[PDB]
Design an enzyme around this catalytic site. Sequence first.
Site, PDB file in Angstrom:
ATOM      1  N   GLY A  30       0.826  -1.226   0.000  1.00  9.98           N
ATOM      2  CA  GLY A  30       0.000   0.000   0.000  1.00  9.98           C
ATOM      3  C   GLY A  30       0.849   1.260   0.000  1.00  9.98           C
ATOM      4  CE1 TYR A  32       0.069  -0.909   3.407  1.00 14.17           C
ATOM      5  CE2 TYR A  32       2.029  -2.085   4.102  1.00 14.17           C
ATOM      6  CZ  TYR A  32       0.770  -2.095   3.527  1.00 14.17           C
ATOM      7  OH  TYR A  32       0.219  -3.260   3.078  1.00 14.17           O
ATOM      8  CB  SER A  34       6.415  -3.892  -0.515  1.00 10.97           C
ATOM      9  OG  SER A  34       6.223  -2.914  -1.526  1.00 10.97           O
ATOM     10  CB  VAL A  35       4.740  -6.124   4.700  1.00  9.96           C
ATOM     11  CG1 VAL A  35       5.082  -7.096   5.821  1.00  9.96           C
ATOM     12  CG2 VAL A  35       4.638  -4.706   5.246  1.00  9.96           C
ATOM     13  CE  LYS A  50       6.161   0.354   6.300  1.00  6.51           C
ATOM     14  NZ  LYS A  50       5.512   1.184   7.343  1.00  6.51           N
ATOM     15  CG  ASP A 165       0.207   1.840   9.668  1.00 12.81           C
ATOM     16  OD1 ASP A 165      -0.113   0.752  10.181  1.00 12.81           O
ATOM     17  OD2 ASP A 165      -0.545   2.511   8.929  1.00 12.81           O
TER      18      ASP A 165
END
Length: 334
Positions: A30, A32, A34-35, A50, A165
């Site tokens: 998203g 934030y 990439s995880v 992340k 977050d």
Amino acid sequence: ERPTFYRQELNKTIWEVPERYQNLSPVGSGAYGSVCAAFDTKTGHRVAVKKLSRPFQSIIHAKRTYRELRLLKHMKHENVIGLLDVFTPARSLEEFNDVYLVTHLMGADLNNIVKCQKLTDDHVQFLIYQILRGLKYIHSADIIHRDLKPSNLAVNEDCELKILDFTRWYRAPEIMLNWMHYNQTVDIWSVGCIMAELLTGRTLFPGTDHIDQLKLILRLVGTPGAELLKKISSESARNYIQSLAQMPKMNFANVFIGANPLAVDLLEKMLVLDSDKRITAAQALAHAYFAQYHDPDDEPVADPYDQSFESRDLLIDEWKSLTYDEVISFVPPP
Ligand SMILES: C[S@](=O)c1ccc(-c2nc(-c3ccc(F)cc3)c(-c3ccncc3)[nH]2)cc1
Ligand SMILES: [Mg+2]
Ligand SMILES: [Mg+2]
């Protein structure tokens, strides 16, 4: 003193991580970043890696990147994400472009919660308890989440819950619009909307915009009274609200019918428009609803946090350097 990194491209994204982290599997992406889920060969536990998205593409991003690294390095609490590792492939500040964050893998969030549910809904108590326990800690360092919602709150197979977050459905009406100097208790409102949603199954206030959102909130909690109207410094808002037909505060017992009456009492203390009248995390833990789990000897406060950088106004190369300094100075938990 520097480990061995290995390249990998997972759906059009470069992952360069130390070789200790294996079997990288994407779990989501998203704004934030990439995880990836991964196996940590050093500790032997399952971790989440992340990769920050476009960390230094503006002064906002570069400062936001520095903020997240500073916050995450500060958090030592069971109900808040802790950093196991922070690293960059770059051998120096000159070529320092990407930042990776590592924490223990959390299988799901409060949107999912199938591993924790039982007919009595005694799961809700434990889940909200953990949120409040982590908010007390966060709030004790003068940190406020602001955008608290079910996808921000991770949960394991063990139903351990953690915050990370730091829609508009869960947003406190005071920060949707901005009447008063919004305090910590904005988050307690979001917990209100979350708790309710866990007890009914439906979103409490599923508003289609800032107009519809305030309409739905006032339907339940009634239009501001004499003493609340007084403390609104914005004329726009005081006009906005006084121009609307007077709504009465509804009976919560009738709205949340068939739910634990101890839960209803807590909701009533969480969903008040006046931020000064609204229950604190510290207070909410002590509410009878949590009598099973509550312990004032194991609900700890955080160390003081230096937020002096928030006011400061620097260039991207300056934030990046400050960010880079925080990666090199990192030390994992003992
Ligand atoms: C956009 S939504 O609010 C959202 C934002 C961040 C994340 C999100 N950020 C992380 C995450 C991972 C590693 C870190 F070091 C820090 C945060 C995780 C994570 C951590 C552990 N196991 C699984 C996932 N989820 C999830 C949803
Ligand atoms: Mg996720
Ligand atoms: Mg922590």
